[PDB]
């Protein structure tokens, strides 16, 4: 607690490191007041150990997807601090997209497909897909392999890690259908216009809040309180614009509201669901 440790859900810390040590060094010297005298990273591969490290106190902040964050809320291990706002947006959404020349047009005909998601922490690629199937009656097995078929009247799924990997399946023909989020539809290292052109969006999910500060569980409330003022004063000093372009762009932090908190809750429930049925 002479240290704060900033860190995120990450399948490739060796480039993700670079997004969080600027804003945590922009950070560190501005808390000196509530005791805290250094600062440390600490990533992890997903978010059963991130949660672990939070609720041990190895980790003291993370900024993660609504979905991810509600993960890390339900096993006890962090609340929320802020919302964060990306790219200059507030919220996204998941879509689900398959080739032109596919015979799919509507997430119904999902049944007999295979959707290609990302991992298990993934907000836009795994939470708010197997939420909407869930939804809409659309039972959705895992698959083990690209060569394993789903039953016939359910869809099955696949995962594939990282969101290119959704694209590229996609469009070599290998699996149906993709998830991916709005956001990263225009996002060229995750959708290539080389692979976009050739697809066709079937479905969209309602909106969730983009991201979320969540701190750790116990946190002194004094480093709590000045964490908050802290991140938002830093949107508009200009010593921290190159530090929040780094952290995922990030363009906005904002105070907790009776309305996020109510979509949070939302969101966590159909969370909750998704882990009580996959
Ligand atoms: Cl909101």
């Known amino acids: 607690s002479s240290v704060l440790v900033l860190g995120r859900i990450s399948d490739d810390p060796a480039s993700h490191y670079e997004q969080l040590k600027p804003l945590l060094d922009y950070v560190v010297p501005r808390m000196r007041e509530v005791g805290i005298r250094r600062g ?11 949660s672990s490290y939070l609720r041990r106190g ?16 339900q096993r006890g291990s962090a609340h929320p601090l802020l919302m964060t706002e990306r790219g200059g947006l507030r919220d996204f959404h998941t879509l689900f997209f398959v080739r032109r020349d596919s015979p799919i047009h509507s997430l ?3 049944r007999g497909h295979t959707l290609a998601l990302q991992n298990a922490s993934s907000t836009s690629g795994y939470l708010l897909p197997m939420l909407e199937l869930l939804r809409n009656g659309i039972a959705c097995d895992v698959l083990l392999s690209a060569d394993d078929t789903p039953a016939r009247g359910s ?35 995750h959708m290539p216009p080389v692979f976009k052109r050739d ?3 079937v479905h969209r999910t309602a909106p969730v809040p983009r ?3 969540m701190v750790r569980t116990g946190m002194d409330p004094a480093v709590e309180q000045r964490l908050r003022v802290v991140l ?43 882990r009580d049925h996959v």
């Open 232 to 274: 938002l004063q830093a949107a508009s000093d200009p010593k921290a614009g190159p530090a929040l372009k780094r952290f995922f762009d990030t363009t906005g932090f904002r105070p907790l509201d009776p309305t996020s908190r109510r979509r949070l809750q939302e969101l966590s429930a159909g969370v909750q669901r998704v």
């Open 58 to 73: 190895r980790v003291d902040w993370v900024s993660e997807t609504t979905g991810a964050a509600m993960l890390l809320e």
């Open 108 to 110: 119904s005909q999902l």
């Open 199 to 201: 697809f066709r969006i």
């Open 211 to 213: 991201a979320v500060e």
């Open 40 to 50: 440390e990273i600490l990533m992890a591969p997903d978010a059963r150990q991130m």
């Open 155 to 189: 869809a099955g799924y696949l995962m594939v890690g990282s969101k290119l990997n959704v694209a590229a399946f996609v469009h070599k023909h290998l699996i149906d259908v993709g998830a991916l989020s709005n956001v990263d539809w225009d996002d060229e290292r």
